[PDB]
Amino acid sequence: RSAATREALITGARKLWGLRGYAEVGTPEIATEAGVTRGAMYHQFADKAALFRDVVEVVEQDVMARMATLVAASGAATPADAIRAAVDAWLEVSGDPEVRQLILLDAPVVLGWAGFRDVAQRYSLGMTEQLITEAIRAGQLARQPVRPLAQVLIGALDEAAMFIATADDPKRARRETRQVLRRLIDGMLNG
Amino acid sequence: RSAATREALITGARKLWGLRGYAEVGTPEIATEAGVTRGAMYHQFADKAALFRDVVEVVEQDVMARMATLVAASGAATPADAIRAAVDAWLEVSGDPEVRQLILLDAPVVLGWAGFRDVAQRYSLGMTEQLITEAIRAGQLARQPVRPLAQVLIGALDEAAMFIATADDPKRARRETRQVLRRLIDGMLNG
Numbered sequence: 001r002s003a004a005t006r007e008a009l010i011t012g013a014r015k016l017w018g019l020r021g022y023a024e025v026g027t028p029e030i031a032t033e034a035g036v037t038r039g040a041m042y043h044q045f046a047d048k049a050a051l052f053r054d055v056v057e058v059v060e061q062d063v064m065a066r067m068a069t070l071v072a073a074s075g076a077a078t079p080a081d082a083i084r085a086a087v088d089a090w091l092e093v094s095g096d097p098e099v100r101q102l103i104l105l106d107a108p109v110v111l112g113w114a115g116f117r118d119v120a121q122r123y124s125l126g127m128t129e130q131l132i133t134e135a136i137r138a139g140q141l142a143r144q145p146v147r148p149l150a151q152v153l154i155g156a157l158d159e160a161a162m163f164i165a166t167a168d169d170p171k172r173a174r175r176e177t178r179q180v181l182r183r184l185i186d187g188m189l190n191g
Numbered sequence: 192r193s194a195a196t197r198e199a200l201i202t203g204a205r206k207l208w209g210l211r212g213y214a215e216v217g218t219p220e221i222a223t224e225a226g227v228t229r230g231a232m233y234h235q236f237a238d239k240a241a242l243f244r245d246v247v248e249v250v251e252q253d254v255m256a257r258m259a260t261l262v263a264a265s266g267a268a269t270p271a272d273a274i275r276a277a278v279d280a281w282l283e284v285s286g287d288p289e290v291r292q293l294i295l296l297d298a299p300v301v302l303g304w305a306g307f308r309d310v311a312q313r314y315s316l317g318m319t320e321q322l323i324t325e326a327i328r329a330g331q332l333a334r335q336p337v338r339p340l341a342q343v344l345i346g347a348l349d350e351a352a353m354f355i356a357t358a359d360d361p362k363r364a365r366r367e368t369r370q371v372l373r374r375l376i377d378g379m380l381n382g
């Protein structure tokens with residue numbers, strides 16, 4: 001009931017901000033797109049940023065599900081290959097124009113640096129730790145504490161995507177950044 | 192005269208916000224600390240955040256000077272060694288409680304994402320590109336476009352420092368993150 005109003009607001013905001021950016025669409029337009037009144041919207045979300053926070057949750061969940069799907073489909077036969085495929089999967093999902101606009105461009109502004117990292121952490125860490133733990137167990141990555149490596153890799157990957165997202169030639173940035181990420185990955189991976 | 196008032200406000204704000212955080216010290220207390228009136232302060236800085244921006248400039252300049260000093264003192268004889276020493280120097284300068292409070296914690300909040308990145312870029316990028324260009328010229332790092340590598344390393348290094356700054360056991364986080372960065376560096380450096 002209130003749940004339905006929330007879902008419709010989230011879906012509408014996600015679509016519209018996905019196309020034009022956070023800064024460019026006001027809450028009244030989103031309400032109308034969702035078919036709810038300003039009163040019903042304000043009951044669910046005190047302000048714009050509160051709606052954005054729930055939009056980021058749904059988008060990041062879908063980012064993580066899409067990553068798992070691409071890693072499972074990549075045909076990686078070793079943990080090392082799976083790490084390589086995960087890097088490609090992120091460059092692929094981060095290039096989706098909605099993910100680019102909402103996560104790479106709008107979320108660092110609206111949530112701050114700490115808020116963005118918090119979101120990135122909660123969604124990304126588990127899978128990152130997992131892939132690391134598996135390469136280690138297979139002897140393909142030197143034995144280490146998992147959390148610090150995970151954190152650095154996440155920071156490097158999030159920054160890679162941002163650099164592609166704002167570059168004048170996205171196509172060249174993506175290719176050159178992929179090479180960079182490859183070398184950095186291949187420098188810690190054994191074989 | 193008013194120049195002196197500017198310097199004393201910057202020095203006082205830097206010290207006090209360094210110790211207690213931006214949010215915890217008001218402009219009246221900083222005026223008093225510097226021995227100047229509210230009207231002299233307001234003549235130099237329209238508001239609190241304007242003062243903070245100048246504080247960030249002097250602190251980031253000192254971050255960069257202290258990094259150059261640590262790299263020059265390491266006795267690095269090759270570009271590779273200089274990259275190794277620069278990584279250590281950043282973890283060391285990052286861990287200064289004033290740098291931690293003003294740059295890592297307060298600046299993202301007060302400046303906003305775009306403003307903070309802009310500042311971090313202007314102070315970091317030049318030196319990062321330089322050390323990369325030198326390792327390449329020496330044959331110690333594979334020939335590649337400089338900007339993408341620079342940006343990924345910056346993202347990894349900024350995230351390393353953030354993780355140390357907010358970790359439960361900062362001392363263990365620093366040591367383990369340093370090891371991680373060393374492996375990652377040693378994997379790409381030919382020498």
Ligand SMILES: O=C(CCC(F)(F)F)N1CCC2(CC1)CC(c1ccccc1)=NO2
Pocket residue numbers: 060063064067083084086087090103104116119120121123124127128131132153154157158
């Ligand atoms: O969802 C995010 C970031 C979301 C954001 F909100 F911060 F933007 N990802 C980046 C990190 C991951 C997941 C996707 C993990 C990963 C990986 C690759 C190789 C070895 C270990 C982990 N690649 O991408």
Ligand SMILES: O=C(CCC(F)(F)F)N1CCC2(CC1)CC(c1ccccc1)=NO2
Pocket residue numbers: 251254258274275277278281294295310311314315318319322323344345348349
């Ligand atoms: O000032 C900042 C960051 C400011 C922040 F606002 F983002 F926090 N620095 C981080 C990156 C640098 C310089 C200092 C670059 C560097 C290095 C080391 C090895 C090879 C290449 C570059 N070490 O630290």
